[PDB]
């Protein structure tokens, strides 16, 4: 029981009952999210997409966390040119829990 | 309210500090460039000096005189 869907420009392989950290979405922290753009629905028998976004498949997930990613330091330094620059970044994420996969 | 008085916006510049870090901008000779007469402490040419060329106040001629009557 697993499916592949594209949400934030990248495809995620998720099975039933597991949480996946994906790109932040303008959505509430406790509202079920619907993703009708699913690439494959997998079972004992395999069904493949003759055209993108299957025919009636959809992914039902619930948002869990809306925090930020780990600290990453961006250090730019030029050798012998009296130049160095410091910068930090923390990419936002919206963790969701995959609770239901349709056919 | 004594600890509330603040200066008007734009009334302070904070100045410029030379030779203080890399991100401060004008450091490492702080805005006077690499080797040269200007880069040395106490350097620079006197007023009107044109690197040996005759200054304007030397190439131009004198004319007229100061009249004491005009001062009274």
A85 in B contact zone (CB under 8 Å): yes
**Tokens (6 digits) for A80:** 């012998």
Q: What would the DSSP string read from start to end of B34-58? A: SSSGGGSTT-S--TT-BTTBPPHHH
Q: Which residue of A has its CA nearest to B25?
A: A83
> Resolution for this model in angstroms, one decimal place?
3.0
B34 in A contact zone (CB under 8 Å): no
Q: What would the DSSP string read from start to end of A67-79? A: -B---EEEEEEET
B21 in A contact zone (CB under 8 Å): no
* Domains held by chain A: number: 1
Q: Which residue of B has its CA nearest to A82?
A: B22
Give A55-60 contacts, CB < 8 A, sequence gap 24+: A56/A102, A56/A103, A57/A3, A57/A102, A57/A103, A58/A34, A58/A102, A59/A3, A59/A5, A59/A14, A59/A34, A59/A35, A59/A98, A59/A100, A59/A101, A59/A102, A60/A32, A60/A33, A60/A34, A60/A98, A60/A99, A60/A100, A60/A101, A60/A102
What domain range includes position A75? 1-103
| A84 chain-B contacts, CB cut-off 8 A | 22-23
SS3 B27: coil
Residue located via tokens 């349709």: A102
Contact A66, A94 (CB under 8 A): yes
Closest CA to A43 of A16, A10, A11: A16
CB contact under 8 A, A85 and B28: no
Maximum separation of any 2 CA atoms in chain B, in Å: 65
A34/A11 Cα distance (integer angstroms): 15
């Amino acid at each position: 029981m697993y499916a592949v869907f594209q949400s934030g420009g990248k495809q995620h392989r998720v099975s039933e009952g597991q949480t996946v950290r994906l790109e932040k979405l303008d959505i509430a922290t406790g509202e079920t999210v619907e993703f009708a753009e699913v690439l494959m629905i997998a079972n004992g028998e395999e069904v493949k997409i003759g055209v993108p976004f299957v025919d009636g498949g959809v992914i039902k997930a619930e948002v869990v966390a809306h925090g930020r990613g780990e600290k990453v330091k961006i250090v730019k330094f030029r050798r012998r040119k009296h130049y160095r620059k410091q910068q930090g970044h923390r990419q936002w994420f919206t963790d969701v829990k995959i609770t239901g996969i349709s056919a | 309210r004594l600890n509330t008085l603040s200066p008007a916006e734009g009334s302070k510049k904070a100045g410029k500090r030379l030779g203080r870090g890399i991100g401060s901008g004008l450091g490492k000779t702080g805005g006077r460039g690499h080797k040269g007469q200007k880069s040395r402490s106490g350097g620079g040419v006197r007023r009107g000096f044109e690197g040996g060329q005759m200054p304007l106040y030397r190439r131009l001629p004198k004319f007229g005189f100061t009249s004491r009557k005009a001062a009274i």
